[PDB]
Design a protein around this ligand. Sequence first.
Ligand SMILES: *[C@@H]1O[C@H](CO[C@@H]2O[C@@H](C)[C@@H](O)[C@@H](O)[C@@H]2O)[C@@H](O[C@@H]2O[C@H](CO)[C@@H](O[C@@H]3O[C@H](CO)[C@@H](O)[C@H](O[C@H]4O[C@H](CO)[C@@H](O)[C@H](O)[C@@H]4O)[C@@H]3O)[C@H](O)[C@H]2NC(C)=O)[C@H](O)[C@H]1NC(C)=O
Ligand SMILES: *[C@@H]1O[C@H](CO)[C@@H](O[C@@H]2O[C@H](CO)[C@@H](O[C@@H]3O[C@H](CO)[C@@H](O)[C@H](O)[C@@H]3O)[C@H](O)[C@H]2NC(C)=O)[C@H](O)[C@H]1NC(C)=O
Ligand SMILES: *[C@@H]1O[C@H](CO)[C@@H](O[C@@H]2O[C@H](CO)[C@@H](O[C@@H]3O[C@H](CO)[C@@H](O)[C@H](O)[C@@H]3O)[C@H](O)[C@H]2NC(C)=O)[C@H](O)[C@H]1NC(C)=O
Ligand SMILES: *[C@@H]1O[C@H](CO)[C@@H](O[C@@H]2O[C@H](CO)[C@@H](O)[C@H](O)[C@H]2NC(C)=O)[C@H](O)[C@H]1NC(C)=O
Ligand SMILES: *[C@@H]1O[C@H](CO)[C@@H](O[C@@H]2O[C@H](CO)[C@@H](O)[C@H](O)[C@H]2NC(C)=O)[C@H](O)[C@H]1NC(C)=O
Ligand SMILES: *[C@@H]1O[C@H](CO)[C@@H](O[C@@H]2O[C@H](CO)[C@@H](O)[C@H](O)[C@H]2NC(C)=O)[C@H](O)[C@H]1NC(C)=O
Ligand code: CA
Ligand code: CA
Ligand code: CA
Ligand code: CA
Lengths: 354, 355, 354, 354
Amino acid sequence: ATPLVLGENLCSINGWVPTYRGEGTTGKIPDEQMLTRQNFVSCSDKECRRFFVSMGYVSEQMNVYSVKLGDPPTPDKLKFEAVGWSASSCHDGFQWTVLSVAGDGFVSILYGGIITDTIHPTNGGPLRTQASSCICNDGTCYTIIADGTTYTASSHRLYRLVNGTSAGWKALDTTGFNFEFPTCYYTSGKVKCTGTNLWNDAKRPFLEFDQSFTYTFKEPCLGFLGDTPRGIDTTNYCDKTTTEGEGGIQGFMIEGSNSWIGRIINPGSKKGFEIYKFLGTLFSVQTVGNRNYQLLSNSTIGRSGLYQPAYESRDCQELCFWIEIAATTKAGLSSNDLITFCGTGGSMPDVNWG
Amino acid sequence: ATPLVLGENLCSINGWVPTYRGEGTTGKIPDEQMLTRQNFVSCSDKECRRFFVSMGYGVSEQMNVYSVKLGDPPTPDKLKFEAVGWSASSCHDGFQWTVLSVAGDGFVSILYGGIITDTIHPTNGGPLRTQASSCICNDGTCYTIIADGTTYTASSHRLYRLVNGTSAGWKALDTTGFNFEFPTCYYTSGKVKCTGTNLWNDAKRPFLEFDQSFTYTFKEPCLGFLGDTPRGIDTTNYCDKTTTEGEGGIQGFMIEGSNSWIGRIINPGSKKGFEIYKFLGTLFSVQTVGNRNYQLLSNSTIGRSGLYQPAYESRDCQELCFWIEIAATTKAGLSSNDLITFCGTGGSMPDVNWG
Amino acid sequence: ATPLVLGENLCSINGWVPTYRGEGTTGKIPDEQMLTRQNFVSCSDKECRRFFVSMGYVSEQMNVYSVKLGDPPTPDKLKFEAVGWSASSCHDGFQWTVLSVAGDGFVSILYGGIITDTIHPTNGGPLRTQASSCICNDGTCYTIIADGTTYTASSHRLYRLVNGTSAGWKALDTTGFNFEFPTCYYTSGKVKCTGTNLWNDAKRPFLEFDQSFTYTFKEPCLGFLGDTPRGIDTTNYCDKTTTEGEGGIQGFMIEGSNSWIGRIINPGSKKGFEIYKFLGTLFSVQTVGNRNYQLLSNSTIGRSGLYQPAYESRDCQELCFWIEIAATTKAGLSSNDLITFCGTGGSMPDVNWG
Amino acid sequence: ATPLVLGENLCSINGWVPTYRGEGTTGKIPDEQMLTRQNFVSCSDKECRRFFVSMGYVSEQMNVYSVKLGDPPTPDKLKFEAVGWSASSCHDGFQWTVLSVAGDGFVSILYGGIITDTIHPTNGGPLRTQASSCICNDGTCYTIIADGTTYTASSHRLYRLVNGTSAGWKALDTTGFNFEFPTCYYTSGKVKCTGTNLWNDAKRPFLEFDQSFTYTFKEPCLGFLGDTPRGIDTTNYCDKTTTEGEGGIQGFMIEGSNSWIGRIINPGSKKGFEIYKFLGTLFSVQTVGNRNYQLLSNSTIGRSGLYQPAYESRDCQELCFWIEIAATTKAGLSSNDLITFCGTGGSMPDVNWG
Ligand SMILES: *[C@@H]1O[C@H](CO[C@@H]2O[C@@H](C)[C@@H](O)[C@@H](O)[C@@H]2O)[C@@H](O[C@@H]2O[C@H](CO)[C@@H](O[C@@H]3O[C@H](CO)[C@@H](O)[C@H](O[C@H]4O[C@H](CO)[C@@H](O)[C@H](O)[C@@H]4O)[C@@H]3O)[C@H](O)[C@H]2NC(C)=O)[C@H](O)[C@H]1NC(C)=O
Ligand SMILES: *[C@@H]1O[C@H](CO)[C@@H](O[C@@H]2O[C@H](CO)[C@@H](O[C@@H]3O[C@H](CO)[C@@H](O)[C@H](O)[C@@H]3O)[C@H](O)[C@H]2NC(C)=O)[C@H](O)[C@H]1NC(C)=O
Ligand SMILES: *[C@@H]1O[C@H](CO)[C@@H](O[C@@H]2O[C@H](CO)[C@@H](O[C@@H]3O[C@H](CO)[C@@H](O)[C@H](O)[C@@H]3O)[C@H](O)[C@H]2NC(C)=O)[C@H](O)[C@H]1NC(C)=O
Ligand SMILES: *[C@@H]1O[C@H](CO)[C@@H](O[C@@H]2O[C@H](CO)[C@@H](O)[C@H](O)[C@H]2NC(C)=O)[C@H](O)[C@H]1NC(C)=O
Ligand SMILES: *[C@@H]1O[C@H](CO)[C@@H](O[C@@H]2O[C@H](CO)[C@@H](O)[C@H](O)[C@H]2NC(C)=O)[C@H](O)[C@H]1NC(C)=O
Ligand SMILES: *[C@@H]1O[C@H](CO)[C@@H](O[C@@H]2O[C@H](CO)[C@@H](O)[C@H](O)[C@H]2NC(C)=O)[C@H](O)[C@H]1NC(C)=O
Ligand SMILES: [Ca+2]
Ligand SMILES: [Ca+2]
Ligand SMILES: [Ca+2]
Ligand SMILES: [Ca+2]
């Protein structure tokens, strides 16, 4: 048993390939499955797991469960993770760390299935996890937690975790903006994170940091707006797009030699998902845009987020993402499911997946 | 490939958070689950397991001992068959699971791995009774307590030491004047410490501590915060039995430490809610105080409760947890049990309901 | 991996404990379970397994299956083992060796699930396995196969196997008698086996041999008749009681410090099962008869055999036995299931298990 | 821990014995079980596995799964592999490589369950995997992919895979024929494949190649026609039998000291499977043909393919095959399942295995 360590260099990405299309490909989800909520994917040294929150088939009776990515959320296949309605998890090579918001809005850290730490609100609660995979590398896990009673006065903290106990935190300067649900990936000695501004920005705030918690917030300079809601696409500039900048939904950008922005196509009817390659940094006006894949056209789209398969010693680090989709049960209840794409260096055709 | 060894020093505890919460705590248990009873938790050096005795399905497969990995539902797919019996205790020494199971007319079979390695028989009439809880293993040897006698008014109890599934000798315990059923135990500071249940003449709970040389002393809590159910009104502090409503009782625990705890059922009438009270100092002085009463559960109907220590740690202190058995109902309407578990936090918690 | 290797010394046995009781020990088999016949138990170095033959819920349709001892034979819990109507198995530390009679009556030998040898009838056919766990020790496996068109003129061969392959064999002088379904065990450098005489004996014959094939048949000098059917019990004499010596059923004896013989108590209706202790060998006439255990009463019983749980490091080799019981399904179909008992050094109360 | 490396020399084969026989061969299929299609068998260093494509209990709702050979395709024994309707797989000693076709018809390579590469058509698609085990030896894996919109103008490529990454491919000259669904085996420094010609040949095209991609297409010189459909068997000649050469179904030949050709007995009602021994090469007009085994009699037959077990210290390389058969579930939906045969050194009696 050895610490999970990710790749220093990303695989080159030129397109995306489905690795899972959830139980609603038939149009409807089987009623024996749990009503699933706040879905995200995280990977260990041996598998990828689907984590979500559920009650049955904010409440005192929501739990965090996981199944193996690809297994359907039936009673047989469920693993109880924690009590809570907001969760983040990640694996370090030894054990799952699961961060969960429960009770009056504090977070409990479970390692294996043992409480290793709790964290309590300080700016008025409730605490909010990043609702996405956290990042473990070489024995340490990193995560981001939000406090504050309004998005207009939110506070954000960067946590480092060792075997599930807090090894410290750092206040992030988020003056002038809001930074919810950061979804992250590791590369070249940095964790890089895309968050959601529910207050004043139709673009997404960006964050990178290293293990010394030296950090930088960045604003994407591209008029292709990532948030939903949002207005008309703008010319390229380096500061915030404030128009329709209130509200928002979890989503991601990828910054690399090729950069990407994934977004909901129609902000009004939350229908369709597109992801768009750019030749260069998200943070220059001069960068151009090379290819836009319409991955979904007909499904209604909720949250989306990044994940890194890690069971590897390979020459190149793979990158994936999940999308939470509005679904309907056979009986006719509203629910979600979850689809996943993974990167490829191969240039892909135009295929609509749903 | 090494003997399980527990921390000599317990972590500080000032609060409790759930680690597992069965579906029946917040609604109906799914019908595909095995109906469980006599639940308890025991941990190895790799995982925590939920041991239990089955009652079948929605009228089917009963009478046996099973385990699942704690966190997993008792669906057919997740069941490890363990032994034949209606009553079991288990423990793990680093090598294999030891399982004490009562069967037949009340003899105890001992299984190490799945291998029968010993058998224990009643002197004083039977039927024999396990502690219905985890046994304690440390550094190769495992300890457990077994009850004999036909009435709670004439109960005998024995301390058993076990190596690799075989009996490495035993001591008769002096329980003259009280009853000591279903002890739940923990290890710290060189002693095994157990909390028993007196179904005869005490509404407080009897206490035991002992080392590997079978040097024991039984203690009696000097606290008027009455641990058993049933029970009467809370009393003044005094250092002997509360005989009033001391007949009957349910398995439950006390924690003795720098900080002490008593967990009990809140309404002894309708068996509703569970509380755990922190005490500053020992359970065995009349001066020790009373600091914070946590009302962990309110909604649900409580039964047995027990202690367990996880030991797949690489932690600098020994963690302590407890399990609470809950009366619940299946989707079909059959009544059944499951489980909530709690482990200690070093920091104080808010007043919150967990079930 | 490493080779499976047993204890040279048997644990003392003064009593018997049930390790597993089927659904049809306790009344009626559910209809979703397979219809097992030819049940027996063989152990590996990690688990004991229940092997049987089934056909649905001599035929081409017959297959060999197995489950983990304890698991019910629901389709979900089944492992296909071979095609056949007769089977012996055993584990060498590396792989399950499985002998199966199939086709016209040749035995196929599977190692893993790959065929490593075939054995064909010379003396008439069809061939017949020992219907019971064969024995493996130190990388090498031993079994006994029978040929002959009738039990009068039956031939018996002793096979040595390594990794699934015939490593030579030996003919056994069974002039005089018949040696069907030997059920065996190992100690003291010898493999001791108990056969069923369907010809001229209502006692059970007895084999022992070493790894270098030196063997001797012995006759129990004992008037406690083990085979079924049988006559009234007799005084002790060292010759075959030929009285209702025709007919027969699979069963065992144990030779040791204490020695045992189990049998169906009533050969009329085949109800109840008893097992009886003796203070010394079965092959002296002078040997007493101590405690008799009435393990089963109201149940109509059938085949029984031996197995040695082989996953130790130990001061003693455990020894067990299975009993095959007639049973009924919820729709009223006739079928079987299985109960097991293991030894324990101490004496046991008089308990009736069904 | 180490690369899987196969045996340079085949076992002597003079007969076949079943090692798995599905429940639907000998009756109806339990409806708990998944509805398998495109079944085939691939082996690792530890086990043989049954791969297939299913929907539930060019279709976009399909996925690739697998179970261990011998277990049933019940939910508990299931394993998700990939999205897609067409799959090939092989193990290298480290990880499963799985080739899957999805979307409009590109292929994805998964290694572990991690996406490691894609492959794209340039001749119009969809792409088609060999629908059978691909071949790994000494760390590198080989597989063959088909492209093109008619079989009249089909196109084929031979890929070299290393840890799930493409290390190159070579065009195969299939001028004047079609080469679908090759099913292959390894010996004597060569990979040998039997294909299916849907265009202009009732015999089966054959292909051998070495690790440096030197290859030779051969036509079998035997008038015992391998494909279905086909016409009247003819005389031995060394080129295509064009009549009834349109259409076809996946199947195999074996080239050895003893050669074999397995085929469906009745081309019209696809019932019965036979396999014919030839004393020598499939590629001389002179070679003769000795023993014909009628293996299956009752069953309706479809696809058939080769696989080689590698969990072994045999002294000689074993060869097996699987046959997909039409079947019905208890509730009477059409499905398939599987019978597998492995080679034995001895000659065998004429038994009906299904
Ligand atoms: C302990 O029990 C309390 C209270 O018990 C409640 O009353 C008892 C007398 C008994 O009848 C119980 O069955 C009953 O639950 C539980 O606290 C309740 O928790 C539920 C669910 O979280 C809350 O129900 C919600 O009420 C909202 C407005 O008051 C309403 O907006 C919600 O609707 C939403 O969800 C429903 C599905 O349930 C959906 O249909 C709607 O469309 C919408 O999404 C919902 O109905 C109660 O408010 C709570 N009651 C009180 C007084 O606190 C508690 O959960 C339980 N604890 C545990 C851990 O089991
Ligand atoms: C977080 O958890 C990990 C996993 O338990 C801890 O890593 C472990 O650290 C200990 C201390 O070095 C190691 O134990 C020692 O291992 C060496 C060599 O194997 C041996 O010589 C010693 O006798 C001792 O057993 C252990 O190997 C290592 N875990 C592994 C397998 O990598 C880590 O210490 C924890 N971190 C903190 C701060 O609690
Ligand atoms: C039956 O199968 C078993 C398992 O495959 C065979 O046992 C194997 O024997 C070979 C040679 O005797 C062993 O190889 C050697 O291993 C030792 C270390 O133990 C190493 O020092 C040598 O360099 C060499 O590699 C092999 O380990 C062993 N397998 C195991 C797991 O024990 C056996 O030979 C087979 N029977 C026959 C006679 O074919
Ligand atoms: C209980 O079982 C364990 C494991 O089988 C035994 O530990 C082994 O003891 C032997 C004999 O001294 C050593 O050779 C091994 O190295 C030990 N194994 C390990 C992993 O420690 C132990 O001896 C047994 N205890 C008794 C008293 O029987
Ligand atoms: C393909 O995968 C194997 C397995 O990971 C690689 O073999 C490893 O090679 C490195 C470098 O020498 C060693 O550190 C590992 O110990 C090897 N693994 C094992 C278990 O043998 C192999 O190098 C890979 N090939 C390429 C080029 O990717
Ligand atoms: C192939 O078909 C025949 C005909 O149905 C099967 O033969 C029957 O088998 C059963 C049980 O073995 C017998 O009771 C019948 O008497 C047989 N009928 C005939 C006409 O032979 C045969 O079993 C089938 N083979 C397989 C393996 O499915
Ligand atoms: Ca916004
Ligand atoms: Ca009491
Ligand atoms: Ca006889
Ligand atoms: Ca053709």
